[PDB]
Design a protein around this nucleic acid. Structure first.
Ligand SMILES: [K+]
Ligand SMILES: [Mg+2]
Ligand SMILES: [Mg+2]
Ligand SMILES: [Mg+2]
Ligand SMILES: [Mg+2]
Ligand SMILES: [Mg+2]
Ligand SMILES: [Mg+2]
Ligand code: NA
Lengths: 179, 313, 57, 59, 148, 45
RNA sequence: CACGCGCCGCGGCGAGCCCGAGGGAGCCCCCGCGGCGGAGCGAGCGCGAGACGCCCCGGGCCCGCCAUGCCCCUGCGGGCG
């Protein structure tokens, strides 16, 4: 009692600590990597566990073409993704690479199996390289959602976003002096 | 991965390989979700009458007569309001409520496959209510040919060592508690084994055994694989049903069975291996914490702080 | 029936509740109102510098 | 000093003696370690936390 | 399901989360979108520019299948060829047995020029092309054609 | 903080550190008693 | 409670996705179009995107609308800026 605790102190913050998903595979993986980090203190494992706790809206997908373009100076390393890897038909040919992901499309899996690559699961990554030796951690673009592009106030002079519905008039939509 | 086949008297006679549907991952959450949706799709609608409570003539008296302002009938009886005797509901129930639910085809297929895979686990079959101490193998496959007399069906049931589960149900019939016993749901019995056949006549023999249910192999029902939403149910397969199930899934056009994954037991094996152990590094010893005591109380406590013993007190 | 016209009694306390927010660190380097001839020259000098030009090849 | 003068009517202050300082530390001394309040009962704690500044005991 | 809803956790509290001074009344601001230029002017100006007024010419009956015009970019062209034929054609950069693609048979009218092409000759038939689409095609050895 | 050394090494080093601390404590106590007395006497002089 | 709109969490699949109506005599099984997404801008005739990047912010370039300079074929059309 009788103490001042609101003068140089801010309110607490809330962060995720558990995956939140019913899928038992993700719970198992999160717990295993948390144990590994507890017993080694490595940064790769810490970031991996944090990523495994993220929500689906914060885990964008990654294409094979983007993966190829990102492995230009490091073809011998292992690409690690905490999301699904999809196919890119726009790319006629793909090189040989090693990728570890949560999921693969059937087409992406088959394309990687051809060309001599290897598709890896997080279970095998834990079995072989628990601390991520010779591994690169990658993610997609978090601002690519269509919902993200409509945040803000369309009618203000300094915003650069569009209104949400369909608008047919002219008042305030044809320059700074349309009002 | 082989499966033993038994004859009508309980002796092995043949052998079959394990169909790939039995390698699907076990997902209780998906089975629960699909069970809930499908079971809500079977209800019949109900609602009150649209004319209930509004067939009388009632109007409010105003203020100035020393009575509350609700509507009244000619003699002065209150009417219409939901807090008046005889009035209408505040929000009467209607039949335009959404009674059904939608489930994608892929998730329905996933749920049925996962329940089938659970049915071949033995541990799950025991965790669910089933007396399978005397059962030879799981899956249980029997070559029964055609059975049209209940006596022969009972003979087979005793031969394959599954009679205790039929007697479990035969002795459990009783009258249900509460309302419902007057709504055509008077009696309740426990759940027994499930028979899956194909191009064979076993229905007439098996129909009248309490607790037993029948299914054709080309149209398996999920509400029967997971009664009460609990997945592990004991199944008796005929030989033809097993052989055909081998490829009933190949007739689902452009469908791929979901990929197998690791389980809990397979994880600590990985975590206890040397390859993962080589990376472990011990953490320093923790801080030492003791209760605060007055050093001047005793000379030992004082010596803990000033070894020289030069402090007068 | 008259009510109050104006008060600023509680306003300074509300302002300080979450601190006084500073501007963004990109508002200091905007080109919002700079002289166009200066901006055009800066663009061309960068593009012709081999060590800092983003033109391909 | 100027800040102390501004808060004057909430505090009282002065110059302490060696005996006062020793009594305060011996009888009411606690350490801030990682945000916890740890009692001081022996010289090992002081040495472990303040050795880098040539401070090795209560004296 | 009603067991898990927020309203069931307000039993015993008298006003159910609507306040004492204000309360829950019927339509304290009006019905629908009324007031857009009057007491809701700030809301409409902040979030809905171009809501009031007219703009452009009017067509009394739009012909929906005349305005239909699907397009394909030059970087999606090779995905129309199946994989086996794909590797076969890519291996031999033949000039006499070049693949011929008719995008109208796949449901497209015009060809646009986003992306790039594999270095191999090809013949593409469409009803229209963009300026750059033709330029990129001819730099890889292909030729564009117009199909009925 | 992660330590690489074994338990016995930690125990022995801990004992050595404790002995060093005890000796330093005795020396410093004597020195500072002398210092306080001298301060008072010098001010009087 | 029904329908519509916004945002958040979870499941399945993923450049695709989808128990529409309906048909197979199987409430739960099999087959089953639109649509939405995939390219924008422009009153409109219409024209139409690659150059960089773990992620985020910002610069730099590219497309459409408006205005201009130079060159040229099939020309109030094309190209380059
Ligand atoms: K009545
Ligand atoms: Mg009634
Ligand atoms: Mg009762
Ligand atoms: Mg007022
Ligand atoms: Mg009350
Ligand atoms: Mg109000
Ligand atoms: Mg009220
Ligand atoms: Na960017």
């Amino acid at each position: 009692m009788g103490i001042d605790l609101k003068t140089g102190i801010k309110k607490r913050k809330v962060e995720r600590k558990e995956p939140k998903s019913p899928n038992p595979y993700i719970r198992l993986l999160h717990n295993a990597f948390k144990v590994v980090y507890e017993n080694t203190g490595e940064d790769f494992t810490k970031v991996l566990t944090k990523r495994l706790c993220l929500s689906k809206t914060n885990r964008p997908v990654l294409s094979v073409s983007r993966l190829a373009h990102l492995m230009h100076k490091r073809e011998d390393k292992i690409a690690v993704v905490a999301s699904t890897v999809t196919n890119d038909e726009r790319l006629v040919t793909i090189p040989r690479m090693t990728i570890c992901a949560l999921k693969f499309s059937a087409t992406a899996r088959s394309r990687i199996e051809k060309a001599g690559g290897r598709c890896m699961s997080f279970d095998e990554l834990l079995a072989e390289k628990p601390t991520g030796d010779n591994c690169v951690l990658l993610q997609g673009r978090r601002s690519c959602r269509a919902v993200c592009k409509k945040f803000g106030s369309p009618g203000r002079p300094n915003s650069h976003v569009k209104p949400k519905g369909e608008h047919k008039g002219r008042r305030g939509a044809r320059g700074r002096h349309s009002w | 991965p082989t499966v033993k086949v038994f004859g009508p008297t309980g002796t092995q006679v043949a052998e079959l390989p394990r169909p790939k549907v039995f390698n699907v991952p076990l997902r209780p959450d998906i089975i629960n979700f699909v069970h809930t949706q499908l079971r809500k799709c079977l209800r019949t609608p109900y609602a009150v009458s649209r004319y209930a409570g509004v067939q009388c003539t009632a109007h409010s008296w105003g203020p100035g007569r020393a009575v509350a302002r609700l509507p009244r009938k000619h003699g002065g009886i209150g009417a219409y309001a939901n807090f008046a005797r005889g009035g209408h509901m505040a929000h009467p129930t209607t039949v335009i409520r959404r009674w059904c639910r939608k489930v994608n085809l892929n998730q329905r297929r996933y749920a049925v496959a996962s329940a089938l895979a659970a049915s071949a686990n033995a541990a799950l079959v025991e965790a669910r209510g089933h007396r399978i101490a005397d059962v030879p193998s799981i899956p249980l496959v029997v070559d029964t040919d055609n059975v049209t007399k209940t006596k022969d069906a009972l003979a087979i049931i005793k031969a394959v060592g599954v009679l205790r589960d039929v007697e479990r149900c035969k002795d459990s019939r009783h009258i249900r508690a509460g309302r419902g016993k007057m709504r055509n749901r008077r009696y309740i019995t426990r759940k027994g084994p499930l028979v899956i056949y194909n191009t064979e006549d076993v229905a007439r023999g098996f129909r009248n055994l309490p607790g037993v249910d029948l299914c054709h192999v080309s149209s398996i029902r999920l509400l029967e694989l997971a009664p009460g939403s609990h997945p592990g149910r004991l199944i008796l397969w005929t030989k033809s049903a097993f052989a055909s199930l081998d490829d009933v899934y190949a007739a689902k056009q452009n469908y791929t069975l979901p990929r197998s994954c690791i389980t809990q037991t397979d994880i600590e094996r990985i975590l206890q291996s040397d390859a993962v152990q080589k990376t472990f590094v011990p953490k320093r010893d923790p801080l030492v914490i003791e209760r605060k005591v007055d050093p001047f109380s005793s000379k030992e406590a004082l010596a803990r702080l000033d070894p020289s013993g030069t402090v007068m007190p | 029936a008259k009510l109050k016209n104006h008060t600023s009694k509680n306003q300074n306390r509300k302002d300080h509740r979450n601190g006084i927010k500073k501007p963004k660190k990109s508002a200091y380097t905007s080109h919002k109102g700079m002289c166009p001839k200066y901006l055009r020259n800066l663009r061309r000098s960068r593009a012709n510098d081999p060590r800092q030009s983003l033109r391909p090849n | 000093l100027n800040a102390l003068r501004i808060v004057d009517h909430y505090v009282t202050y002065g110059e302490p003696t060696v005996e006062t300082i020793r009594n305060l530390i011996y009888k009411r001394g606690f350490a801030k370690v990682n945000g916890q309040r740890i009692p001081i009962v022996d010289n090992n704690l002081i040495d472990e936390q303040l050795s880098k500044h040539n401070i090795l005991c209560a004296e | 399901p009603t067991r898990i809803r927020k309203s069931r956790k307000r039993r015993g509290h008298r006003q159910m989360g609507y306040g004492r001074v204000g309360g829950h009344r019927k339509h304290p601001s009006g019905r629908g979108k009324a007031g857009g230029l009057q007491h809701k002017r700030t809301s409409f100006d902040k979030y809905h520019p171009g809501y009031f007024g007219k703009l452009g010419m009017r067509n009394y009956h739009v012909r929906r299948n005349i305005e239909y015009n699907p397009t394909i970019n030059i970087d999606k062209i090779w995905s129309l060829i199946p994989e086996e034929q794909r590797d076969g054609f890519l291996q031999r950069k033949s000039t006499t047995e070049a693949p011929v693609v008719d995008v109208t048979r796949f449901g497209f009218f015009k060809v646009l020029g986003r992306g790039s092409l594999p270095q191999c000759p090809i013949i593409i038939k469409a009803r229209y092309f963009s300026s750059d689409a033709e330029k990129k095609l001819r730099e890889v050895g292909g030729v564009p054609l117009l199909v009925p | 903080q992660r330590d690489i050394r074994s338990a016995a090494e930690r125990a022995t080093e801990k004992e050595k550190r404790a002995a060093l601390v005890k000796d330093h404590a005795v020396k410093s106590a004597q020195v500072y008693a002398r210092y306080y007395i001298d301060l008072v006497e010098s001010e009087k002089k």
